Structures are given as structure tokens and as C-alpha cells.
Amino acid sequence: ITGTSTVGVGRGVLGDQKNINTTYSTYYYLQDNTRGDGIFTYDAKYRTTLPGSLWADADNQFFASYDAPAVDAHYYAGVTYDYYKNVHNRLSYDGNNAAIRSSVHYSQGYNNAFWNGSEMVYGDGDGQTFIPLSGGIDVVAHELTHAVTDYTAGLIYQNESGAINEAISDIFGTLVEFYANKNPDWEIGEDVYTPGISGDSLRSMSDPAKYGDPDHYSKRYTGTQDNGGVHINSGIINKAAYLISQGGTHYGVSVVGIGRDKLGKIFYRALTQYLTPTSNFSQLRAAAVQSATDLYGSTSQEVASVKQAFDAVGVK
Ligand SMILES: O=C(O)C[C@H](Cc1ccccc1)C(=O)O
Ligand SMILES: [Ca+2]
Ligand SMILES: [Ca+2]
Ligand SMILES: [Ca+2]
Ligand SMILES: [Ca+2]
Ligand SMILES: [Zn+2]
């Protein structure tokens, strides 16, 4: 759309009020011209055809309950874009300011969200297992990072490379959640999962086993479900990443934490410089070590912690 940039106001999935960037041209659209080539949010109107209609609103106020998921998908995509730009100096997912598109109200009672190779898509949830998925900043950032991976390492979505692809998305989704300071934690999807149950989440990076995911290589899933356990075996990497950041002793191996910022720098470097589409866990470890070496020196503590952390999860 061609029009005038403006700012609107609405309420998100969790009921919080926020301002969002809109464009005015007869209607007010969810089109943010302030970031790269724009962020665009569409209404899929409970259908599965994509992307749907660019979101249009008459008065620039988005307080209807039907509006909530659009408000958050639109807002959280801006935050994520900011994180990448500010923190890693990367312009959008392609590094060249590509437009960011998302659709909401995808299908009926759809308990999922995803990156389809061109855009983000969010279901509204069935109201029991999930509420609308774009209400979780870690979910939004998890999706946008899959775009980042597609344009960089290109990790194939299956088996080990696939689990790495998933872990990357959880790690950066969590780093973004801390960046925005939105009640941050090392859990995944807590804000939109099982509205009826407090305290849980979809996955845990601090203790993957809490939800039955592996936290050691010896416990990896080797069957065929889930594309070869991409959402299961990611726990091994997630745990490694949590250890690098926070420190701890796991299976008798002690890791000194080096903090979130360094975690993010090391992983981003590995992702953008060293990983390839078919990289496996063992290659990820070599990548992460090389990255930390590049950044901090081979005799650094940073390098030492990366090694310890992988040793702790059994990745050699
Ligand atoms: O892999 C994906 O992008 C799909 C999905 C995303 C998701 C993340 C966090 C919470 C809910 C949903 C998953 O099942 O992880
Ligand atoms: Ca309105
Ligand atoms: Ca949180
Ligand atoms: Ca979280
Ligand atoms: Ca819950
Ligand atoms: Zn994912």
C-alpha cells in the first residue's frame, strides 16, 4: 500500500496495550514502513489460503478481540527486527531488509505457527492447548529465526541438522524475549500454552527433560517421527546453550556461564559463517568452538565454556 505512516494503538492477546506502526490510505493498514522494506500483517480469515488480506482497520484503534493476534504478530515482528539489527547488525532475515510478512487467524483451532519459506503463519489455538500463537514473543522470534536460518546456514529440516535448526530458533527466540525484557525465561511458549495451567510451557531449555525431551546425546531419539525428532533432539542443543550462558553442573560436568550476550554472538557467528545445510551436532560443536575462538581467543574462558557445555551434553 502507498500512504502515510502513522501510529495506532491496540491490545494484544494477553490484554496488554501497545502502540503499533500503521499506514494510512482510506483505511489504516498493519503496514510498518519504519523497518527495512516494511512489516505487513494479514488476515487469513480462518482459511488456509495465504497470505490473505492485508490488515485494514477503519479507525487506527485495535481493541477488538479479533484484532489481538494481529496486533501482537505485527508488534513482535518489529521487536525481532530490531533485535537483529541492533544486536547483530543484520537487516531483516535476508540481510538485505526483505519485507516481513505474517498472517494471523490461519485455519480454525489451529494449534501451531510456522515459517513457510516465504512468510510467518499463526493459528489461533483451540483455546485449550493454546491461545493465539502470536501472543508469545519467543514464538514470533522462533519463527523469524527460521527465516534467518533459511538464508544463511540453510539447515535441512530433518535429523540432526533439523534439530539444530530448531534449537537455533529456540535460542534466538529466548534471546529476543530477554532483549524485550518481557518477563524473560528459558522456557519456550509459556505465554500461549495451556491457558488453564500455570507454570508450564512447550519446551524447556533449562531442563528439557522436564517435558520428556533429551538433555544428553546418549538419550537422543533415533526414530522417524517429527522429521526424525527435530523438536525432540533440539533439547540436547538447547541445554548446551543454556549451560554456556548460565553455567551449571550437568551429568557431573561443570560449566562456567559466560552470559547471554556472548552466547548470542557465538551462535550467530556459527550460524552465519560456519554451519552448512547438512551440519550435524558434532559439526555444530566445531563451529561454536571456532566462533568463540575467532571472537575471544583460543585460550579464552569463552572457548573453554563452549567445550565444557558440549562435553556436558555428550556432544563430541
Ligand atoms: O517449529 C515450528 O516453528 C513450529 C512450532 C512453533 C512453536 C514454537 C513455540 C511454541 C509454539 C509453537 C513448534 O512446535 O515448536
Ligand atoms: Ca478499529
Ligand atoms: Ca516469558
Ligand atoms: Ca519464554
Ligand atoms: Ca500454561
Ligand atoms: Zn521451529
Side-chain angles (χ1 to χ4, degrees):
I1 269 191
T2 298
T4 304
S5 305
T6 191
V7 179
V9 60
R11 225 178 272 137
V13 176
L14 300 188
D16 50 323
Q17 184 170 302
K18 54 246 293 178
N19 294 328
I20 41 184
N21 292 125
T22 57
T23 294
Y24 176 67
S25 198
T26 304
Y27 279 95
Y28 292 90
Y29 292 92
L30 290 186
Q31 171 185 138
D32 177 358
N33 306 119
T34 73
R35 296 171 164 103
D37 291 338
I39 295 168
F40 303 84
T41 302
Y42 299 76
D43 187 1
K45 324 175 131 149
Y46 312 133
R47 295 197 65 99
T48 53
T49 50
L50 290 170
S53 296
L54 180 69
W55 199 285
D57 188 88
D59 60 7
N60 218 23
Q61 304 208 34
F62 300 78
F63 295 96
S65 65
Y66 189 80
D67 297 339
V71 169
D72 286 338
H74 196 63
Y75 186 84
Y76 295 143
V79 183
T80 307
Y81 172 98
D82 292 351
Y83 167 76
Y84 278 107
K85 184 194 191 249
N86 293 334
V87 181
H88 298 288
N89 249 245
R90 184 186 187 76
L91 301 180
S92 195
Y93 56 88
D94 72 333
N96 196 28
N97 266 153
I100 294 167
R101 298 180 204 279
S102 312
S103 297
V104 302
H105 295 305
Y106 176 82
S107 197
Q108 293 181 27
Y110 187 74
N111 287 315
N112 213 352
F114 54 103
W115 163 250
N116 74 1
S118 306
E119 58 166 293
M120 293 179 280
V121 187
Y122 300 93
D124 289 326
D126 56 21
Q128 247 226 346
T129 314
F130 286 102
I131 60 185
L133 283 93
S134 58
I137 186 176
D138 48 17
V139 179
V140 174
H142 173 111
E143 301 307 343
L144 196 53
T145 302
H146 278 305
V148 176
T149 296
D150 272 6
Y151 275 87
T152 56
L155 297 153
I156 118 241
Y157 209 61
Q158 83 172 332
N159 305 327
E160 286 186 21
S161 54
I164 289 159
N165 185 322
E166 269 309 296
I168 297 279
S169 282
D170 284 344
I171 291 159
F172 283 99
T174 285
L175 293 179
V176 173
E177 180 171 318
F178 271 95
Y179 177 73
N181 215 356
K182 250 223 74 110
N183 290 314
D185 39 71
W186 292 89
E187 304 285 290
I188 304 298
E190 65 290 341
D191 288 342
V192 292
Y193 188 60
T194 61
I197 308 172
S198 304
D200 57 346
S201 68
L202 194 67
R203 281 190 287 283
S204 177
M205 300 176 75
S206 57
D207 184 11
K210 151 184 227 215
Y211 301 115
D213 293 326
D215 63 1
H216 198 276
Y217 194 70
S218 72
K219 301 184 177 191
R220 67 191 174 294
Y221 174 71
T222 64
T224 65
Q225 266 180 59
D226 190 32
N227 290 108
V230 306
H231 298 86
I232 298 165
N233 290 333
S234 55
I236 296 163
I237 302 308
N238 283 349
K239 183 67 188 192
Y242 167 83
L243 287 170
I244 288 165
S245 181
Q246 304 299 102
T249 297
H250 178 61
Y251 299 98
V253 181
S254 294
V255 189
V256 181
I258 61 181
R260 278 154 18 229
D261 304 344
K262 299 175 169 169
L263 167 69
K265 270 172 207 312
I266 288 167
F267 275 78
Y268 180 79
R269 187 168 177 88
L271 175 67
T272 59
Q273 315 261 17
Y274 296 116
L275 297 172
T276 70
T278 59
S279 292
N280 61 27
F281 283 14
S282 173
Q283 280 159 331
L284 166 62
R285 163 188 183 126
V289 170
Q290 181 62 243
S291 307
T293 296
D294 294 348
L295 300 167
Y296 301 107
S298 65
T299 62
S300 64
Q301 174 64 254
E302 287 83 359
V303 167
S305 302
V306 171
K307 286 162 140 237
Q308 284 294 299
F310 280 88
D311 280 352
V313 295
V315 181
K316 266 48 183 212

